Paper text:
As the virus buds from the cell, the viral protease cleaves Gag into several fragments, including the capsid protein (CA) that then assembles into the mature capsid shell (core), rendering the virus particle infectious. The CA portion of all retroviral Gag proteins folds into two separate domains, the N-terminal domain (CANTD) and C-terminal domain (CACTD). In mature lattices, CANTD interactions form only intra-hexamer and intra-pentamer interfaces, while CACTD interactions are also involved in formation of inter-hexamer and inter-pentamer interfaces. Our results show that, like lentiviruses, RSV is sensitive to IP6 in vitro and in cells, where in the mature CA lattice IP6 binds in a pore formed in the center of the CANTD hexamer.
We acquired cryo-ET data of CASPNC CLPs assembled in the presence of 100 µM IP6. The reconstructed tomograms of this sample showed abundant regular tubes and pleomorphic polyhedral CLPs. Conventional subtomogram averaging of tubular CLPs with regular diameter and shape resulted in a reconstruction of the CA hexamer at 4.3 Å resolution (left). The EM density map revealed a similar arrangement of the CANTD and CACTD, as previously reported for other mature retroviral CLPs. Given the inherent twofold symmetry of the tubes, CA monomers within tubes are present in three symmetry-independent copies. No ordered density for NC and also no ordered density for the β-hairpin, which has been observed in other retroviral mature CAs, were observed. As reported for other mature retrovirus CLPs, intra-hexameric interactions are established via CANTD–CANTD, as well as CANTD–CACTD interfaces, while the inter-hexameric interactions are formed solely via CACTD–CACTD interactions maintaining contacts across twofold and threefold interfaces. Notably, an IP6 molecule could be fitted into the density in the CANTD hexamer center in an upright position, where it is coordinated by two concentric rings of positively charged residues K17 and R21. Hexamers that are separated from pentamers by two or more hexamers, are essentially identical to those found in regular tubes. As the structure of the tube-like hexamer with C2 symmetry was already solved at high resolution from regular tubes, it was not further characterized.
Residue numbers in the entry:
A (entry chain B), B (entry chain A), C (entry chain C), D (entry chain B), E (entry chain A), F (entry chain C): 10 to 229
Amino acid sequence: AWTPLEPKLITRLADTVRTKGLRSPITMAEVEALMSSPLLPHDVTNLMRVILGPAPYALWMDAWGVQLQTVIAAATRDPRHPANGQGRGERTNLNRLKGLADGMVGNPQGQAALLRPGELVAITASALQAFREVARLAEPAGPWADIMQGPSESFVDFANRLIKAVEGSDLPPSARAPVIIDCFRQKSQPDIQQLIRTAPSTLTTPGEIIKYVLDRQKTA
Amino acid sequence: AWTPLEPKLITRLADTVRTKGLRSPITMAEVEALMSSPLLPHDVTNLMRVILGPAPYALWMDAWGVQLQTVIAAATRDPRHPANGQGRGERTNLNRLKGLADGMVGNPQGQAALLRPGELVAITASALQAFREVARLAEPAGPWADIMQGPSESFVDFANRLIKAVEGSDLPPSARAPVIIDCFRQKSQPDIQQLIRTAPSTLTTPGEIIKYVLDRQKTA
Amino acid sequence: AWTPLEPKLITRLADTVRTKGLRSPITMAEVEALMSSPLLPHDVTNLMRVILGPAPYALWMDAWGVQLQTVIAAATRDPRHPANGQGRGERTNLNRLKGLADGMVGNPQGQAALLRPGELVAITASALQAFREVARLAEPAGPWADIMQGPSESFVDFANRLIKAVEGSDLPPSARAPVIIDCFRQKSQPDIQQLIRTAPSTLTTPGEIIKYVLDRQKTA
Amino acid sequence: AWTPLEPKLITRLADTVRTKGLRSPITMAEVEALMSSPLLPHDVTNLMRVILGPAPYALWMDAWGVQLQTVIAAATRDPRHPANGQGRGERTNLNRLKGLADGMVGNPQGQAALLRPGELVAITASALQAFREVARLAEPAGPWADIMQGPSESFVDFANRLIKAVEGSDLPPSARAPVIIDCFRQKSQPDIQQLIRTAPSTLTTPGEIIKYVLDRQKTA
Amino acid sequence: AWTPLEPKLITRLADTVRTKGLRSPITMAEVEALMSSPLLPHDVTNLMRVILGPAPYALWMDAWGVQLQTVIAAATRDPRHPANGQGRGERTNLNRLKGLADGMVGNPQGQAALLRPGELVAITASALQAFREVARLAEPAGPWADIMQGPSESFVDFANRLIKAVEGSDLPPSARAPVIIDCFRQKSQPDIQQLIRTAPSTLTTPGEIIKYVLDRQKTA
Amino acid sequence: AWTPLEPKLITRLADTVRTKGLRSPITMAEVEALMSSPLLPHDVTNLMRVILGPAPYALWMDAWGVQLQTVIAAATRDPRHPANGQGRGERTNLNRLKGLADGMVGNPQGQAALLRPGELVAITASALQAFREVARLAEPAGPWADIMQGPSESFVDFANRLIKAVEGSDLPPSARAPVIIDCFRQKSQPDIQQLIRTAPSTLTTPGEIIKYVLDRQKTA
């Protein structure tokens, strides 16, 4: 059974993209809303082709190959992975997921009949990762470290901007909390620094420091 | 029998939360009518990621963690809590809820394949109250004990402003009515003072005070 | 099986009550259509909380109290009351309406499996009439007997102003038509008075007088 | 059982009326679409109040009284009329239809319980008649006889204009076909006259002459 | 068990027929998908009045009358026609269909209370073909035997224009294909002539001729 | 119980095919979603008549002929064919597909109660692939090997033009990637050629080359 899409969502998506571009929050928001449920290679290909021009679509496909092979390596790391099902004649492979699987080419009905959903979930997540990667590459803007809380910007939206910027750069996972917190301390508006340095030095994640500064933040 | 959310609903929710605001009611009403059915961790996580930016999402992870800690303490300290099933040998921990042990990690299919309705509704409730706290922390409520009814205003919009503000306090759940009424009597203009005092003092609820002072107010 | 209210309904209702204003019949007909089917205390109360400001919300709560008070007093006074409970321990009571008694709070399923349909219809009736009362007392109808036809406003716009004024006041049914007639024959400009008092027949209904002036209307 | 309306229809109606006015074709079109099915006095009153300003609403009510009493006289003319049902304790009366019937005031549920539909159909038809009457009176334009097929207007739309104009004037039923046809012959563009005078003089209705001139009409 | 039409459908139909046009397909497709269920005279009459102006409505009454005459002749001359029921004593006449005898006059309720499905579907079919004829008569179809493929055009839009036009003729239902093909071969530009002639003459259907001449045409 | 197609679906589809143009993937995904469930000959044929011009309609009819011809020939050649009929007189045939045989014309109910679901799936498959073929042959894809990078167009827009060109031609799957690569290394402007031929690694996929130029892209 295949559960396709509806032209309402796709059309509103195309219109929002055409009027804003992939650097929009609402763009990626509608994309994430459309791509939460388990999907199929056919639908995700067609959707990305709806929202992306030709050459960025090719770049999308390259990124998708990279992420998909990462997930393939993960599947190799363990049989009990959801990508390596309890039938051994179903070992996952770079061709299996990508969609050119046997008896399914250009015929998503077979992709609905003989695929296993957890694979599709991994596909979807890797797809969104690659899509943010394409948003980065095709449309760059400012690097992360060089961001400052403006002479008038409210703090929490500055925090949103900064976290979204940092996590979407070449840094690895482990370097996503303390780097952000130190950027807070040594770049944000001075009063907020004096606020932060007072914090008990046993606090870890950025969100905890955000909660910290939110209480003590004034109402102007 | 698992089922995700038809992206129409998450889409509309994201639209209204990006537009209107987080403290106004319709936000909460939609969220509740959405977050009532038995859910799962992966169900609410990506939902929060979609309807919230990065930094309030970090706050949300924080508050959800605290509430899950409360639920786990309550469940383990009382095996009579719904968070457990037919057997005591299957206690419920934080990992079982935060999606950390096997049969669960990044496996929405497995998360459908495992937990019992008790833990499900528990997690949903935790998420809901977490969202309320993220609302209150994430945006200011005016200085309630300061607003002074301005001349060119009507008493009614002043009263609505004041109830809105006073609700946004640490104040206990019940003891709002006396605070509100006394702020009415002692916080208004000259004329409203002298038209509330001289009443037959059987008016001891806010709505009635509004009824009075408006019913005897200028019509032009 | 308690079916709640579709959030889209409530949200569009809020948009209407917002822009289109309370005292416009769009709102009246819509709210009637939303509270037409059988309805339940918790749902409709939270509804009115959603679609209104908090102070008019408390105003509505008080009006609902008074209306349901007449209803429960009528149920007391009459055995064959429209919404009585013939069971030998199944009579009605006020706290079995406002959602207060055992198993009413938080669990509308109890509000369904404890209450009788006649009770729900009484609740909905009182709620609707209460909302209308809040509408009347929430917007100050202009003073009617102060209108005097302008030196350069069209006759028909004057008529609309004055009739919308008259129908919206304390005046009982009988106090509509004749008051309108006489305000027309007197409050009007002399020229239009010169006409309508050049009586060639009995002008004994507002619409008829408007028809006369319209037939005799030189455009100005 | 009462089947109310939906805010979509009513709101689109109000918007179309506000942007065009009752002299619009689309206005009356949407009104006729909304008012085809059996209705009730409550809904028709509220709807006309939605689309009509105050004083034209009163004039609407006067016209409705006239048409309703015509239908009452018709009901008197025969018992087997659908307005005089097969229960004699249900003889129709000017108060019965108009909506101030017993046990139904401001409570359309009773109007749904104890009214008979054919009465409601007669009500609706008389309502639309009165509404066109109000469109006439409040917003007149050109008299009928003085219309000419323009130096460039296509014939069939001129025919629409002329028929709609004539039938909506003081002429009675019988004088609606030959009057129109003779206006065709002695006012329309000359070539079309020469077309018509050639027609066999045994043709009666206007539509037949319209069909006649449509064939022989050129394509330019 | 009678039921009218939910005014949403008539509303949308009126919108599209006022906007698009009467000869283009979607008009006919909607009308058919609307006019297929067993109907009644009053069902289709007001529908035609809503989705058509006055004068084409007169044409419609004309054509509906002619088609009902055909149906009545066919029914009475063959008691084996569905337009009759179990009994011969209940023949079907024009008055029984045009709503003229009792139990029917202006009585949609009675019209539900009387006729049998045969006459119903007969009336619906009559109305449908009447509408087709009103379409063909009410608007021009271009001079099909005249259009000559212009230079700056592509052969394909020319071909679509030509099939559209040729369809709008008195021409018999079947014998269109030869007319179309020969107009192709003898009505086009020089180059298209010399690229249709020199083919291997197994092309004897229109679509194939289009396939050829386009597949061998300029791409720029 | 044959459920037709909702007219609103078809009408919005026509609006899309109208404005958004055939060769845009919005249309492809939509039409797939409209012909995804089991479908029947008469309905889908009339659908394609609705959503297209008549000449491409006949083109589609011919393509449908060829596709269903391969399908019925495969059903002949294989007993265990995907859509065979195991009954001893229940084999398939071409005229039992195009809606020609007894009880197929005008009465789709026969098209349901005579045909097997495998037959319907074959019909729908052939219809969809036929529509895609009409899409290809209906819009002339620009000549690809004629592109040469402009003296002042952005690199990425050039890339989009050329890739959309390449994927849309006669070229089989294998004939996509490498042709793109080499057209990039050669057709491009000298400066971008100067870059991409200063090879510091293997550039063996279009997306990779785009990524290289993008990383090295001075904005122009």
